[PDB]
Amino acid sequence: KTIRIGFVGSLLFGLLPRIIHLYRQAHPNLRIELYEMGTKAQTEALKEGRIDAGFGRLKISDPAIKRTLLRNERLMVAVHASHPLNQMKDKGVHLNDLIDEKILLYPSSPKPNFSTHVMNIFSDHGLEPTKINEVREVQLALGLVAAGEGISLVPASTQSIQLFNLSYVPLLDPDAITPIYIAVRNMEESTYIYSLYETIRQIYAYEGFTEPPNWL
């Protein structure tokens, strides 16, 4: 009678909480254990049975795991209000506008992680940011930006964090995205997981995202 759900910390700023809340309303008799962990930990947790569902942001594929893309979330650039890039907030900027800026990557957790994903997007277009500095967590990066130490690339849902003189600029490159996946065991056929799928679908319909006909 216990569902165990793993999730990367960055998903706390997006739709995940309202998904869990709606899921809990339909399941008073179920025990919802929420675990914060990275995609690499979730994969091992799924096989072993430590979690039943995993929400992550990278696609490290595995025979025993069925991962489904929920959506591609936009990346944005966090800048100080006075930064030149903040003059291009309405229309947006491109990745190649960022290469001579002091870029704050995060987290400092084991790789692969969000900083590896960010650096991969740059390297996918032959872009080479020379002024790079890795810090521990998202709020540290935003704090440092607000204090005037650089810029940071962040998921759009990070706008949940509003700091004094911190502005978020849209990125125009189509592939300036960070995906969100739900991962379950390849064999999975539980009514709890399918109801979780249903809950996610229900909320994605409320927001009105573009989804295939066979999606979940």
Alpha carbons 138 and 154: distance in angstroms, whole number: 8
Alpha carbons 31 and 203: distance in angstroms, whole number: 21
The site map against Cl ion for 62-81 (x = CB under 5 A) is -----------xx-------
The DSSP secondary-structure symbol of 39 reads H
* Count of positions (residues) in the chain: 216
Q: Are strands 53-56 and 103-105 parallel, antiparallel or unpaired?
A: unpaired
User: Which entry of Cl ion, a copy of itself, none binds 156, CB below 5 to 8 A by partner kind?
Assistant: Cl ion
Alpha carbons 188 and 186: distance in angstroms, whole number: 6
> Nearer Cβ to Cl ion, position 37 or 142?
142
Burial call 33-66: b when 16+ CB within 10 Å, e when fewer: eeeebbbbbbbebbeeebbbbbbbbbeeeeeebe
> Nearer Cβ to a copy of itself, position 96 or 160?
160
User: Which entry of Cl ion, a copy of itself, none binds 136, CB below 5 to 8 A by partner kind?
Assistant: a copy of itself
User: Which entry of Cl ion, a copy of itself, none binds 17, CB below 5 to 8 A by partner kind?
Assistant: a copy of itself
**Number of residues near Cl ion (by CB under 5 A):** 3
Query: Is 71 labelled as part of a ligand binding site?
Result: yes
Q: Candidates 12-20, 48-56, 90-98, 177-185 — which segment interacts with a copy of itself by CB under 8 A? A: 12-20
Residue numbers belonging to the annotated binding site for cis,cis-muconate: 10, 39, 114
